[PDB]
Design a protein around this ligand. Structure first.
Ligand SMILES: *[C@@H]1O[C@H](CO[C@@H]2O[C@@H](C)[C@@H](O)[C@@H](O)[C@@H]2O)[C@@H](O[C@@H]2O[C@H](CO)[C@@H](O[C@@H]3O[C@H](CO[C@H]4O[C@H](CO)[C@@H](O)[C@H](O)[C@@H]4O[C@@H]4O[C@H](CO)[C@@H](O)[C@H](O)[C@H]4NC(C)=O)[C@@H](O)[C@H](O[C@H]4O[C@H](CO)[C@@H](O)[C@H](O)[C@@H]4O[C@@H]4O[C@H](CO)[C@@H](O)[C@H](O)[C@H]4NC(C)=O)[C@@H]3O)[C@H](O)[C@H]2NC(C)=O)[C@H](O)[C@H]1NC(C)=O
Ligand SMILES: [Ca+2]
Lengths: 208, 788, 207
């Protein structure tokens, strides 16, 4: 029978004014025989009709997937309102109801520290610019890098890790050619979190 | 003679369609008793290909699991083919497309080059046709879900396939061999089909499981609508599948009956099966189909696993009695073959349909040999030669799209009861060299034109009747000039009377004019309502573009006559002829650049509009409309304005001046401001704000609208913000003392427009003072409207 | 019905001679009614009889059953498959779970110690950081030390797949600023199969 999965918005989208956050609802293993899938969306038990259902997508022979995407208001999400997705189908005994809301708990402001390469790494053609973000709660966060106003894109960020004080921390690691580091270019580590002013801070990192 | 000289006669008589409707079946090699796996062990002893009955016209050898050194292959070549040929069953080898495209098989042994692909093709014919001892090749080109084939792969496949078509098939060196494609791709997503269709004997479309709609054949009819442009219906074959053993979700089609615990033989009943549906199904157009085929014919008669097992899987496997292997009688196959051969549509065309033997011959060669083809054929029929006496039976070609009568010298009469009903719905009618024709009656066929009638070759004409058609015989019409020739032809043999030159009672159809004249309309300031459609975008034309503006012009049109004989039907109302201009909308852009949708304009003040008139799907007319002296078109002076400061995101503020409403500006609050620079001083006459709900990307509720705000100009008329330090610039623009209001907003309108007192200002600021709710207010676009 | 989870050995245990690595197999949600749970263990499809099943544990009316197979360091590091097979009356068919070490050319970790940020030095506790990058497979172990004694107030990130196909992580030891400024030496120990004796140490002191 059909299953339902309800995914929350990307944390950057909830926190940034330039972006529009979305709750997404996926129905998998839909039969070819009874294909009509009706979605109903609720925000604190209040029906909303502004959702946008994408058409079916054959996964394998005679089995489809159906996604519905509800745009959310930044404030509603951040105030921890419940988003309920209700799915109906002929091959269901009763409709399926899945709910998600934002992680509750006293927010704690992230502390952002940029760390330069190790002397030992400077023997290599590419060096590692590091950004430490610690002491934040909840674990919803987004980290990006930049340089001269342009996005730097060759980076990887660790998942949040629970620290011993109940808060979270992570590391992001931008990799750059040593040449660019030594020439004295400035790099920026952008952190986005609900407990920051305007959900945003930037720390810089250049050669001393 | 030989196994190859017998097989050539099967292929020939199959290709020429002498078997009636065809039944075919894919036999799975690994269910023949001669088959062995890689460990050289027998796989299934229960069945053999030799037992396939004569009702199976074509047996497809479908290979997997059978090892390539198996004794099966010798048995197929040396034993089965001989046995099957004796009853008149052809063998066809099925290979996959990956055999051609480089992905597997002999295609990885030959380069993807014009010469390499040719040599490969010949290697494939030898490997899979000549050496296996069979009568043809069937290429299987299926839908990929995951590792979709590269355009380079499909292009190769086609090139290899076309080379195979040189060696075997209808157009090959060796015509003792069938060439077939089976597929699960629609024409739109099947580029190989399009390229090879001309060389195929059959396309075998697998339609296992439901294909949508109440009768579960939507996809078949929709697909055929495309297939018919590339192949004849006599080449088209649809397939169902039998229940395969241990089949999981993804291969459960329910094309045959389910297990019944009280009737072991239910699997052998074809009543209420998709199999019977496909046997019965025929195309709407083109003609009767070639036949049907089954997948896994070795499973003929086995009941389907019950619906309750519909979602069983390879891991989560729930086996059932019907998953066991069993000997088959091919009971279902023989019932489905008998059904099709007993169908009355496949009855041949006899003298009861078309009496004239000469006409019957030609129609058969062109449309098909079955009664049910006549109904369906929807292309061209060219009738020629002096043997045809009469055209009786031609009326049965109800869907015929074009009829060409060429040098039919013994045809003396054409009446409307002879021609097909398609002639009343604009089918083409050509006739050239009708030297024996004395009477041309085309009355009551709604002919909108006389095109196709070569009047000069109709040299023995004595009478004609083209009355009760939809002709425009007005003075400057081509159709009148053709009528004049028809009368001159008649006048050569006898004095022109009414009894031999009927052309009256025309009800010409109305069309919308392609272009309207008015490019610049004008009204006085008369304080009256005017209608832009009635005044400027009006009128109806004929098929020959004769313009009738109004009722009065239609009256004059009706009074028209040839030789004092009024040709228009008297009982034909203007209401019928005229176009109603239904769902025509008028889009009006003012000098304000404000937009409205209305055909009405009350001429109260001086104004100029740009007018775009829409039929519903497209714009049919543009023009300018000056009310009174007019007004000079304003421009948005704020378009592409430079943001120089804002209380919020700097980059987001720039989206108020991009000219779309596809993104919004807001802040984490109910108040914000954006200061901007038009670059020069210009005369600002009005302004316009497009509020939150104007968003054309996310359906935005009006509760997110700006309720209150102020537009402002800088006080210091001539200050150089150019030369100011960034830090000072922000402090300066933030400080309310430097700004004078020039406009107020007090309404959460979707669009807010007000006038300005001829404001000359380079620098501006728009402050949001409050929202329509607690939700932080948004807006999408800001215009400052005036002259440069 | 009952579920099965099969956990690999702790990477330090596979890499250190002093330690004995173990594959562990856990059966959860076993019913009171049909409680008998039989385990079968396989190493490259070859049955082994040296496993050790611990008795049931009420985790209501539902038990948990753990079976622990000792492994040879070499077998694990050569990437042999460990299959755990569970039987039960409330199972339709037995459950089979397999784990092995990730196959692939091993790559030696590069260990870099990073001192606190200038900005963190305003705080009463500072973060000593150890970056380990370019290692494969992802089985690794990181510890801290100072003056021969273990430092224990640290957290390490899970391995993260880098853009070059190798892994990296960060370990973050937290110390009182006083201890950092007084010029004590700290050590970041890294244990991985691609290191000599599966071990290196990088030092970190005030500069
Ligand atoms: C999806 O459905 C379509 C049909 O539906 C069509 O498309 C959908 C989307 C809708 O639009 C429908 O309306 C529309 O009709 C399938 O297409 C036909 O469908 C049937 C089944 O429905 C297929 O039969 C299966 O075929 C495989 C083997 O298939 C060969 O051909 C395929 C295409 O050419 C290719 O994809 C395969 O890889 C394979 O190709 C070959 O590869 C080998 C090397 O691997 C090579 O030597 C061959 O020369 C080459 N052959 C070619 C190119 O033709 C067959 O294995 C399947 O049977 C197994 O499963 C059955 C239960 O499901 C079971 O009863 C069988 O006995 C058999 O199972 C096994 O038996 C052996 C021996 O005893 C044992 O060793 C195995 O362990 C055991 N294995 C398992 C797991 O059961 C089955 O017959 C047709 O291929 C296909 N095409 C045609 C022309 O009919 C499409 O295949 C479907 N997709 C999937 C993933 O199922
Ligand atoms: Ca905009």
């Amino acid at each position: 029978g059909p299953s339902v999965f309800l995914f929350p918005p990307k944390p950057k989208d909830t926190l940034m004014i330039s972006r529009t956050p979305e709750v997404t609802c996926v129905v998998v293993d839909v039969s070819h025989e009874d294909p009509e899938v009706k979605f109903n969306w609720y925000v604190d038990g209040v029906e909303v009709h502004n959702a946008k259902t994408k058409p079916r997508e054959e996964q394998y022979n005679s089995t489809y997937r159906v996604v519905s995407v509800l745009t959310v208001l930044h404030q509603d999400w951040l105030n921890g309102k419940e988003y309920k997705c209700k799915v109906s189908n002929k091959a269901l005994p009763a409709p399926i109801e899945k709910t998600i809301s934002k992680a509750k708990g006293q927010p704690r402001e992230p502390q952002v520290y940029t760390l330069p390469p190790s002397r030992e790494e400077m023997t290599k053609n590419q060096v590692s610019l590091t950004c430490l973000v610690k002491g934040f709660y909840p674990s919803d966060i987004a980290v990006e890098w930049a340089s001269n106003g342009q996005p730097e894109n060759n980076y990887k960020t660790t998942p949040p890790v629970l620290d011993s004080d109940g808060s979270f921390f992570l590391y992001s690691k931008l990799t750059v050619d040593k040449s660019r580091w030594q020439q004295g270019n400035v790099f920026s580590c952008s952190v986005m979190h609900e407990a920051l002013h305007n959900h945003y801070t930037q720390k810089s990192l250049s050669l001393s | 003679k030989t196994d190859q000289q017998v097989g050539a006669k099967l292929v020939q008589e199959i290709r020429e369609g002498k078997r009636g409707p065809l039944y075919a079946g894919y036999f799975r090699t690994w269910h023949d008793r001669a088959s062995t796996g890689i460990d050289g062990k027998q796989q299934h002893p229960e069945n053999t290909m030799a037992e396939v009955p004569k009702e199976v016209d074509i047996l497809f050898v479908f290979h997997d699991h059978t090892a390539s050194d198996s004794p099966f292959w010798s048995e197929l070549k040396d034993s089965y083919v001989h046995k099957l040929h004796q009853q008149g069953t052809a063998l066809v080898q099925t290979i996959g497309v990956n055999e051609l495209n480089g992905r597997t098989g002999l295609s990885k042994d030959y380069p993807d080059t014009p010469e390499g692909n040719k040599a490969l093709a010949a290697a494939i014919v030898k490997a899979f046709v000549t050496d296996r001892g069979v009568d043809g090749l069937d290429i299987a080109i299926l839908h990929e879900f995951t590792n979709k084939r590269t355009p380079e792969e499909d292009a190769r496949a086609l090139n290899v396939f076309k080379e195979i078509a040189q060696l075997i098939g209808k157009n090959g060196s060796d015509k003792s061999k069938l060439l077939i494609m089976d597929t699960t791709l629609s024409v739109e997503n099947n580029p190989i089909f399009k390229g090879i269709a001309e060389d195929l004997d059959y396309l075998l479309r697998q339609y296992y499981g439901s294909q949508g709609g109440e009768a579960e054949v939507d996809t078949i009819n929709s697909d055929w609508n495309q297939y018919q442009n590339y192949i004849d219906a006599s080449q088209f074959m649809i397939g169902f599948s039998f229940f395969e053993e241990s089949a999981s979700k993804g291969n459960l089609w329910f094309d045959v009956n389910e297990y019944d615990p009280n009737n072991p033989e239910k699997g052998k009943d074809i009543e209420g099966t998709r199999a019977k549906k496909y046997a019965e199904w025929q195309p709407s157009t083109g003609g009767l189909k070639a036949g049907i085929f089954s997948y896994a014919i070795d499973r003929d008669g086995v009941a389907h696993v019950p619906s309750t097992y519909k979602n069983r899987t390879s891991t989560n496997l729930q086996r059932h009695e019907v998953d066991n292997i069993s000997h088959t009688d091919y009971t279902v196959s023989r019932k489905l073959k008998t059904l099709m051969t007993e169908d009355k549509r496949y009855d041949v065309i006899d003298q009861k349909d078309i009496p004239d033997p000469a006409l019957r011959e030609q129609i058969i060669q062109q449309v098909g040999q079955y009664k049910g083809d006549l109904e369906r054929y929807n292309k061209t029929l060219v009738l020629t030669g002096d043997k045809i006496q009469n055209l009786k039976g031609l009326e049965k070609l109800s869907k015929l799209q074009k009829l060409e009568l060429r040098q039919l010298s013994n045809v003396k009469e054409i009446t409307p009861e002879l021609l097909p009903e398609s002639m009343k719905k604009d089918a083409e009618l050509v006739m050239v060299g009708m030297t024996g024709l004395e009477k041309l009656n085309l009355s009551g066929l709604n002919r909108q034109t006389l095109d196709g009638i070569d009047v000069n070759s109709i040299t023995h004409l004595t009478s004609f009747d083209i009355s009760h058609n939809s002709l425009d015989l007005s003075e400057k019409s081509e159709d009148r000039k053709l009528l004049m020739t028809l009368m001159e032809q008649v006048s050569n043999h006898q004095k022109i009377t009414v009894k031999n030159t009927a052309f009256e009672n025309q009800k010409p159809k109305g069309y919308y004019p392609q272009t309207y004249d008015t490019k610049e309309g004008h009204y006085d300031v008369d304080n009256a309502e005017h209608d832009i459609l009635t005044d400027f975008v009006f009128g109806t034309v004929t098929k020959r573009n004769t313009f009738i503006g109004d009722e009065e012009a239609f009256a004059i049109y009706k009074e028209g006559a040839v030789d004092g004989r009024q040709y228009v039907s008297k009982d034909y109302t203007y209401e019928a002829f005229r176009k109603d201009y239904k769902g025509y909308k008028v889009h009006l852009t003012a000098s304000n650049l404000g937009e409205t949708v209305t055909s009405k304009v009350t001429a109260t003040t001086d104004e100029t509009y740009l007018v775009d008139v829409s039929d519903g799907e497209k714009v049919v007319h543009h023009m300018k409309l000056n009310i009174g002296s007019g007004a000079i078109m304003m421009e948005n002076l704020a378009k592409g304005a430079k943001v120089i400061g804002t209380s919020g995101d700097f980059e987001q503020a720039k989206k108020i001046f991009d000219g779309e409403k596809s993104d919004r500006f807001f802040t984490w609050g109910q108040t914000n401001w954006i200061a901007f620079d038009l670059g020069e001083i210009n005369l600002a006459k009005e302004w316009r704000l497009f509020n939150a709900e104007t968003n054309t990307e996310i359906k935005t509720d009006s509760s997110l609208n700006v309720a209150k705000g102020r537009l402002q100009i800088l006080k210091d008329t001539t200050i150089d913000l150019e030369k100011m330090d960034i830090k000072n610039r922000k402090e300066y623009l933030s400080n309310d003392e430097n700004w004078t209001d020039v406009a107020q907003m007090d309404d959460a309108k979707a669009i807010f427009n007000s006038k300005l007192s001829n404001v000359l200002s380079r620098y501006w600021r728009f402050c949001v003072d409050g929202g329509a709710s607690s939700y932080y207010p948004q807006y999408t676009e800001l215009q400052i409207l005036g002259q440069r």
